Design an enzyme around this catalytic site. Structure first.
Site, mmCIF file in Angstrom:
data_model
loop_
_atom_site.group_PDB
_atom_site.id
_atom_site.type_symbol
_atom_site.label_atom_id
_atom_site.label_comp_id
_atom_site.label_asym_id
_atom_site.label_seq_id
_atom_site.Cartn_x
_atom_site.Cartn_y
_atom_site.Cartn_z
ATOM 1 N N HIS A 192 11.236 24.477 -11.527
ATOM 2 C CA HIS A 192 12.004 25.720 -11.518
ATOM 3 C C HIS A 192 12.408 26.116 -10.096
ATOM 4 O O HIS A 192 13.575 26.448 -9.834
ATOM 5 C CB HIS A 192 11.181 26.821 -12.216
ATOM 6 C CG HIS A 192 11.799 28.184 -12.173
ATOM 7 N ND1 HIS A 192 11.811 28.968 -11.041
ATOM 8 C CD2 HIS A 192 12.419 28.909 -13.136
ATOM 9 C CE1 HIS A 192 12.403 30.120 -11.306
ATOM 10 N NE2 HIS A 192 12.785 30.110 -12.570
ATOM 11 N N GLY A 193 11.463 26.044 -9.148
ATOM 12 C CA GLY A 193 11.757 26.178 -7.736
ATOM 13 C C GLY A 193 11.672 27.581 -7.170
ATOM 14 O O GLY A 193 11.750 27.743 -5.944
ATOM 15 N N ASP A 194 11.543 28.597 -8.017
ATOM 16 C CA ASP A 194 11.367 29.980 -7.579
ATOM 17 C C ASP A 194 10.450 30.683 -8.572
ATOM 18 O O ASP A 194 10.683 31.831 -8.955
ATOM 19 C CB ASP A 194 12.720 30.704 -7.448
ATOM 20 C CG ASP A 194 12.686 31.878 -6.452
ATOM 21 O OD1 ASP A 194 11.839 31.887 -5.530
ATOM 22 O OD2 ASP A 194 13.532 32.790 -6.578
ATOM 23 N N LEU A 195 9.404 29.987 -9.013
ATOM 24 C CA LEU A 195 8.597 30.441 -10.137
ATOM 25 C C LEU A 195 7.450 31.328 -9.666
ATOM 26 O O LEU A 195 6.631 30.909 -8.839
ATOM 27 C CB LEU A 195 8.039 29.253 -10.913
ATOM 28 C CG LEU A 195 7.475 29.636 -12.272
ATOM 29 C CD1 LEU A 195 8.616 30.202 -13.152
ATOM 30 C CD2 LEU A 195 6.776 28.471 -12.946
ATOM 31 N N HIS A 199 9.372 36.271 -12.627
ATOM 32 C CA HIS A 199 10.341 35.493 -13.396
ATOM 33 C C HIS A 199 9.788 34.998 -14.720
ATOM 34 O O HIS A 199 10.482 34.261 -15.428
ATOM 35 C CB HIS A 199 10.821 34.306 -12.559
ATOM 36 C CG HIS A 199 11.612 34.709 -11.358
ATOM 37 N ND1 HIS A 199 11.764 33.896 -10.255
ATOM 38 C CD2 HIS A 199 12.314 35.838 -11.095
ATOM 39 C CE1 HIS A 199 12.519 34.510 -9.360
ATOM 40 N NE2 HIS A 199 12.877 35.684 -9.850
#
Ligand SMILES: CC[C@H]1OC(=O)[C@H](C)[C@@H](O[C@H]2C[C@@](C)(OC)[C@@H](O)[C@H](C)O2)[C@H](C)[C@@H](O[C@@H]2O[C@H](C)C[C@H](N(C)C)[C@H]2O)[C@](C)(O)C[C@@H](C)C(=O)[C@H](C)[C@@H](O)[C@]1(C)O
Ligand SMILES: Nc1nc2c(ncn2[C@@H]2O[C@H](COP(=O)(O)OP(=O)(O)OP(=O)(O)O)[C@@H](O)[C@H]2O)c(=O)[nH]1
Ligand SMILES: [Mg+2]
Ligand SMILES: [Mg+2]
Ligand SMILES: [Mg+2]
Length: 293
Positions: A192-195, A199
């Protein structure tokens, strides 16, 4: 922006809104509006905060079409995705946490110790990280190989130190991390990279039901998808999450825990890099604060 401004923007995209709305300013990329159309459907509006966001909007749209096929939980179902406005029907559940609009303090919508959050989050992590590399490549998303990770971070450190500056303590930690071979995995996976909890959507019991903000998704170090958890929940919670993830078959290495701690600690470096890429001074100033310069 006024309520009428938002109504006009939405009407320009075929969405007829009541004047009943409230604003969420948590996000750096998009102003969000909780809105309600005249047929009674609740809408989530994402309005780009900066110029030149067209490509990231079209990328996130593509990401969402890819991931929704592979995940048990809901993701945003975009219906409007212009350069001016992104809109999707509101998802079922509230995020695990919000920020208080006035105080900006964390508001927890579940008990943070909820055990169901850990087991269901592990499942969602397993499903995200299982998305096949062939499909990621076919969707033109960035693919970082294990051999790419340390050179990239080293480049990031040099760029941030040169453009903004960095405290000597943070620099020393980052350079030890880059040199600490055992921490780094020999594989990369779709992330996901921004978890983090902001979120993740869950029922009050903590059962994860949705994941929202997807512009950052690509193939990279899996530890990136665990760092947001340890930042807000702590080291023992992270250990339990890693155990539940492995029970499902999630791919691990002996140092995933240690690597996750270093990724969490690298947050200011990542923020400085992001701020510089945007070229937005307000963002660069915020990053410089976290860098201890
Ligand atoms: C609780 C609420 C807080 O969230 C966090 O602390 C989580 C844990 C960070 O993720 C941590 C952990 C991790 C893994 O992300 C989940 C890591 O990648 C980032 C850098 O730091 C967030 C979200 C980062 O944002 C992300 O920064 C990226 C550089 C770009 C990304 N987006 C715009 C594209 C953006 O959402 C970042 C830097 O802290 C935002 C800056 C402005 C803040 O300091 C703000 C005020 C945060 O304190 C916060 C929102 O109040
Ligand atoms: N309840 C609910 N809140 C949502 C939903 N989508 C977004 N939000 C809220 O709106 C905030 C900002 O939306 P994001 O899409 O994360 O915005 P962003 O600018 O990409 O955020 P960052 O990249 O993390 O800075 C989220 O942190 C949530 O609090 C949704 O479907 N339901
Ligand atoms: Mg967000
Ligand atoms: Mg090695
Ligand atoms: Mg985002």
């Amino acid at each position: 922006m006024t309520i009428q401004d938002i109504q006009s923007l939405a009407e320009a995209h075929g969405l007829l809104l009541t004047d009943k709305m409230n604003f969420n300013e948590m996000g750096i990329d998009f102003k969000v509006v909780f809105a309600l159309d005249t047929k009674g459907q609740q809408w989530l509006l994402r309005i780009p905060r900066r110029d030149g966001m067209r490509e990231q909007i079209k990328k996130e749209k593509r990401i969402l079409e890819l991931v929704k096929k592979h995940l048990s939980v809901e993701v945003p179902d975009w219906r409007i995705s212009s350069t001016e406005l992104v809109a999707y029907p509101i998802l079922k559940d509230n995020p695990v946490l919000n920020l208080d609009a006035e105080t900006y303090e964390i508001i927890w919508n579940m008990d943070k110790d909820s055990p169901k959050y850990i087991t269901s989050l592990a499942k969602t992590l397993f499903e995200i990280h299982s998305i096949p590399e062939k499909e990621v490549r076919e969707n033109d998303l960035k693919i970082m190989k294990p051999s790419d990770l340390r050179p990239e971070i080293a480049n990031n450190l040099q760029l941030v130190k040169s453009e903004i500056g960095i405290s000597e303590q943070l620099e020393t930690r980052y350079r030890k991390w880059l040199d600490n071979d055992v921490l780094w995995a020999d594989f990369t996976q779709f992330i996901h990279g921004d978890l983090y909890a902001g979120h993740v959507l869950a029922s009050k019991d903590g059962a994860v039901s949705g994941v929202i903000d997807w512009s950052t998704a690509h193939i990279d170090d899996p530890a990136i998808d665990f760092a947001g958890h340890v930042t807000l929940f702590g080291e023992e919670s992270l250990k339990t999450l890693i155990i539940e993830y492995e029970k499902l078959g999630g791919k691990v290495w002996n140092k995933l825990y240690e690597q996750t701690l270093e990724r969490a600690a690298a947050s200011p470096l990542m923020y400085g890099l992001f701020a510089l890429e945007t070229q937005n001074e307000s963002l660069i100033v915020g990053a410089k604060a976290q860098l201890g310069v």
